[PDB]
Amino acid sequence: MNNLYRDLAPVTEAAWAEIELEAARTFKRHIAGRRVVDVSDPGGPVTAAVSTGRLIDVKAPTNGVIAHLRASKPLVRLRVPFTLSRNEIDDVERGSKDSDWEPVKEAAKKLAFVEDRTIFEGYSAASIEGIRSASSNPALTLPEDPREIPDVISQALSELRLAGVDGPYSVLLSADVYTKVSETSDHGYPIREHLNRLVDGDIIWAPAIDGAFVLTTRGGDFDLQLGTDVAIGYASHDTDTVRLYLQETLTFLCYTAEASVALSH
Amino acid sequence: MNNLYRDLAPVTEAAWAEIELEAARTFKRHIAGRRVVDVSDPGGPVTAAVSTGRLIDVKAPTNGVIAHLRASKPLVRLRVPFTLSRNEIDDVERGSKDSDWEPVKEAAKKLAFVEDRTIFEGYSAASIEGIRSASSNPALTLPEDPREIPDVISQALSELRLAGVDGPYSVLLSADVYTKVSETSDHGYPIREHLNRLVDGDIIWAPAIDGAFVLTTRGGDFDLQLGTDVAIGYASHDTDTVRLYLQETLTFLCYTAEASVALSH
Amino acid sequence: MNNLYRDLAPVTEAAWAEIELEAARTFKRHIAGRRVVDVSDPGGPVTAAVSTGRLIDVKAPTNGVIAHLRASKPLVRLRVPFTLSRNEIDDVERGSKDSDWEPVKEAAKKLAFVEDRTIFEGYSAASIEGIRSASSNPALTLPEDPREIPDVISQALSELRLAGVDGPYSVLLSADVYTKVSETSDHGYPIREHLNRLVDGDIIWAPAIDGAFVLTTRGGDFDLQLGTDVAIGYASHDTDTVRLYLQETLTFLCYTAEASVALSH
Structure with missing residues (x-):
């Protein structure tokens, strides 16, 4: 019997x-x-x-x-x-087929948010400096006009080029920024189809992060060390409810300080 | 793990x-x-x-x-x-070998009583009209003298004959009526050995019903539809006691309104 | 001989x-x-x-x-x-090769319209709540200018993203809205080729519905339960005419209240 007691x-x-x-x-x-x-x-x-x-x-x-x-x-x-x-x-x-699994969804969403806040924005009590704070490239500012965002993403790609870092590059956008570039258009195309043409990697929806990140996905720069992956365990129960939890053990390490550019507002 | 949690x-x-x-x-x-x-x-x-x-x-x-x-x-x-x-x-x-299984007996008896009240006497919240209410044959009255009961059972058999229904016929007697015909005798034989000679089916002890029923067992008239049969499940427990339950899912349908005769007092 | 009597x-x-x-x-x-x-x-x-x-x-x-x-x-x-x-x-x-099958077409069209009104807009006497009423996402409003419709469809896609629902997404348009986005153009392309680029599923012509729907086609959210599919049966005939009918038995169930967004005028 594992320590999850399922x-x-x-x-x-x-x-x-x-x-x-x-x-x-x-x-x-x-x-x-x-x-x-x-x-x-x-x-x-x-x-x-x-x-x-x-x-x-x-x-x-x-x-x-x-x-x-x-x-x-x-x-x-x-x-x-x-x-x-x-x-x-x-x-x-x-x-x-319509059972209320809403608490399971809330728990999974909160765990995912904690993991992504930890990787990008850090968790100092765990001694995790985030990708934002460890980044050595200068930080850029996102403008309010969504049609200007492709210019700053090309500026960040130029900062990554000057650092000697090669692609493929991916952009991670905040939920707010991802909604703004998805619901705004120029030349009959969403401002986010413009971003898809700037990069050879993906445009990632990142509902946990602030601002945006432009980083290389070449490998060997950011390392997520997993002790145990996400598991469901059993805590307690009474006549009406069952008490469960989601759980994972991990730390994050980053080795290249110039492999990413961070953007804010 | 089934929903019984045994x-x-x-x-x-x-x-x-x-x-x-x-x-x-x-x-x-x-x-x-x-x-x-x-x-x-x-x-x-x-x-x-x-x-x-x-x-x-x-x-x-x-x-x-x-x-x-x-x-x-x-x-x-x-x-x-x-x-x-x-x-x-x-x-x-x-x-x-003398453990107190008396609550198990009470629970099984109550479940059997609920099932038989439902078939014969109905359960209107479940939309189950009983064999008594769905019966189209006239209802007969049981007399107080137990030695007269074989006459009325032969009258009910005549009503079933007039309806064009053939046997084998069985009689279901209430616990009171079954005790009265079992503890009363004429010609040196219980009034219930007289009933056993009137019919080609059985005389049934039915401790749940009122009065009596005379019905045919030819098939295709009364239908008990089982979702799940009687199962024992686990509810709760403390240091002293275990909380269990008996459970079954079913409904009852009857197709022939003249296949039975109901008797009362 | 089936009950259709063909x-x-x-x-x-x-x-x-x-x-x-x-x-x-x-x-x-x-x-x-x-x-x-x-x-x-x-x-x-x-x-x-x-x-x-x-x-x-x-x-x-x-x-x-x-x-x-x-x-x-x-x-x-x-x-x-x-x-x-x-x-x-x-x-x-x-x-x-030019026989008048126009009544067959009218009957098939009316049956299709009844099925689609039932799925999307409901049928309360059948206890069918439609996709519109069961939807938990906020409802959006279609504008009069057809060139603005791609913005609101991207807003609905953002509402589906916020709900945690992943694609592929399809848009169902009313006959009026489908005609408006098909007969209106910007940048030399119909406003409906703009919609085809927003989604990874289809743009569906739905001549029965009001407004529009944006929903996911991932599976396991909307369920059409068929008793019998569309069949042609024979009712009556005289010297001049034959009386036929189209027939189907079904109900509709939906399990996810956030898998769709409904749009109106």
């Missing part, structure tokens, strides 16, 4: 399949960082830190001895608990 | 066998309708209604269109919860 | 083939909902209701019993009668 949950195998389907769908839908960073195989429940290869100076234990600590980054475990109604769980076996 | 119940496999034995025995003992009606195979947890073949007039959605709804009868799920002592459940594995 | 109709096999060809062509031409909803296999003439998996509270038949009705949606049978001239039926065997 066998103790008053949930049927049909309801489990529906919950796992909904969570996987929502997480894959709302996650943007995994499309552009390198994602490693999960290390297991035992892995607790990632080796940086660096040495930290420490006071010698005795004279004539030289001492260093090995430098590492800790993995952070993120848990999002949600509550399900047992009536909706019972309905699944009776053939219901 | 794996979460603090009940051993020996105690489960004893409980299932007791419930099956009591239900088979106290059920009378299944001996005379046609009982179908269970349709499963998904089946929710039985097609009648009829059409209901509905207002047309537009001019030059004719509309009908299909007519159907809903299946009703009946649940009888009961409570067991965990000490008696523990005693079974230690070799005890 | 063997009693004074119609030849050549005329039958021509009538069946014309009806199939017109129905496939004027039907839009079947292009975007899931259409099941016909259940047969016996199927009368579709199980929802839900339970309805009903008053207990006796104390210590818990009762629920199974919840289901009835199938509605729609019949459109039409009249054919027997002279035109006779002409077919003599080699005529």
Whole structure:
């Protein structure tokens, strides 16, 4: 019996399949960082830190001895608990196809948002500097007029060219910026079909981020280290509800400070 | 994991066998309708209604269109919860053969009584008209003298003959009437051995019904549609007790209004 | 002999083939909902209701019993009668290729219109809430200027994105709106070639609907349950005319309230 204790949950195998389907769908839908960073195989429940290869100076234990600590980054475990109604769980076996999986969707969306805020915007208590703060290229400003956004994206591509970084390049846009370039048009084409012609990679919807990011997807610059991937576990239950959670263990490392350009408002 | 959640119940496999034995025995003992009606195979947890073949007039959605709804009868799920002592459940594995399965017996008896009241006497909220109300033959009256009951049963058999219905005929007697014909005698034989000689079918003990019924068991007149048959499920438990329930999904349909005669007091 | 009684109709096999060809062509031409909803296999003439998996509270038949009705949606049978001239039926065997099948076309068009009004706009006597009323996304308004319609369709696509729903997306346009975007142009292209570039699914002509619909065609959101598909039956005939009808039995269910956006004027 794993530490998730799913066998103790008053949930049927049909309801489990529906919950796992909904969570996987929502997480894959709302996650943007995994499309552009390198994602490693999960290390297991035992892995607790990632080796940086660096040495930290420490006071010698005795004279004539030289001492260093090995430098590492800790993995952070993120848990999002949600509550399900047992009536909706019972309905699944009776053939219901409209069960309320809305809390599962909220939990998967919140987990995806936490992972993408962590990669792009950082999480300092976990010692994760984000792609924005680690970026060495100058930061550009997005204008209010959506028809001007293709100019600044070409400016960011020029900053990436000057840094000696080659493509393919992808653009990650905030939900607000993605809506503005999608609902605004010039020459009979959305301002976001203009962006699709500037780059050889994708234009990514990133509802978690601020502003925008232009970065290369050549590989070897951004590293998402997974301890365990997203899993559903069982917490508690009463007559009416079941208490579950979503969970993942990970840390993020970035090696190239000039592989990305960050944009803001 | 089924929606019964029997794996979460603090009940051993020996105690489960004893409980299932007791419930099956009591239900088979106290059920009378299944001996005379046609009982179908269970349709499963998904089946929710039985097609009648009829059409209901509905207002047309537009001019030059004719509309009908299909007519159907809903299946009703009946649940009888009961409570067991965990000490008696523990005693079974230690070799005890006198465990208190009295609540299981009460629950099985109540479920059997609900099923037989539903078939014979109806359940109007479920849209089940009983065999008594759907009967088109005239209703006869049982007398107080038990030695006169064989005369009225022969009168009912004559009413079934006049209706053009052929046997084999069975008589279902109320618990009171079954006790009166069993504990009263003429010519050195119980008044109920007299009834056994009037009919080519059985005399049925029916502790749920009022009065008596005389009906044919030729087939194709009374139909018990089973969604799921009697199953034991697990609700809850604490340190002292386990909370279980008996459950079944079904509806009843009758096609011949002259296949039965109902008797009362 | 089926209940359609086509063997009693004074119609030849050549005329039958021509009538069946014309009806199939017109129905496939004027039907839009079947292009975007899931259409099941016909259940047969016996199927009368579709199980929802839900339970309805009903008053207990006796104390210590818990009762629920199974919840289901009835199938509605729609019949459109039409009249054919027997002279035109006779002409077919003599080699005529211009027989008046106009009533067959009117009947097929009316049946298709009833099916699409039912899916999108509902039919409350059949207990069918339409895609418009079941939609949980906000409703958008179509402007009078046809050159502005691509902006509102991109707004609806943004509402579907915010709901967490992924494509492929299709747009269904009213006959009026489809004519307006087809007969109006900007940059040398119809305003409807602009719409074809916004979406990865189709732009559907829907002559039955009001306004427009933007919805996902990923599957598992809209369900058209067929009892019997469109069939031609024989009603009556005299010296001059034959009386036929078109017929189908179905109901519609929708499971995702955020899978569609409805537009109006």
